[PDB]
Structure 1
Amino acid sequence: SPQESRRLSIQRCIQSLVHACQCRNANCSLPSCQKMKRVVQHTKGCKRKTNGGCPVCKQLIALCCYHAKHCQENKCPVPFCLNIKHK
């Protein structure tokens, strides 16, 4: 169903995020990994985040949020995860 498809797509994106966060290898081939890294870097740099209402940052934060809901591991490399869980 549309919702399921979206949830799966989100989860697959999350797998890429999770991979990328752990993948301390700038030489990684994975376009998805490179993309996630770039998005993460962008977000960290873009202090404006959800204050300015930056779509990139908003998406990363939402992705991280959904990830956090799934991720009971309150010792996760993924940024925001921990903060969201505690919050």
Structure 2
Amino acid sequence: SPQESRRLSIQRCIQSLVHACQCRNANCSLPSCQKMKRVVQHTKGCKRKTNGGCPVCKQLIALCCYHAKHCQENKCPVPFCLNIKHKLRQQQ
């Protein structure tokens, strides 16, 4: 199962995604939160993003997609989650 290491890296980083989307302090010292804050601050202000082909925003949204695929919370703290959940229903 060579997919195991990649699938584990995806879900591990998604815990950091959830944390950084609910974290009560923008200055949080948690190494994973600190790293997540950069990509989070990027995608929310990027004048290009996935619409224009920006790779950074796409890497973040790929994990938001994996999360949303398995998620079901109608008010989930992740901003992209709920959008992907609604988009998935259009594919049926």
Same-fold call, TM cutoff 0.5: yes
Deviations 1:26-83 (A, max 9, x none): 2311121011122111001003111221111000111100010121112101011001
Q: Which runs of 5+ in 2 are unaligned?
A: 88-92
> How big is the alpha-carbon RMSD for the aligned residues of Structure 1 and Structure 2?
1.1
Identity score, percent:
100
TM-score, normalised with respect to structure 2: 0.86
| Bigger Cα Rg | 2
- Which has the larger displacement, 58-67 or 28-37? 28-37
TM-score, normalised with respect to structure 1: 0.91
Aligned pair count reads 87
Moved over 4 A (4+): none
> 1:17, 1:36 within 8 Å by CA — same for their partners in 2?
yes
Q: Which runs of 5+ in 1 are unaligned?
A: none
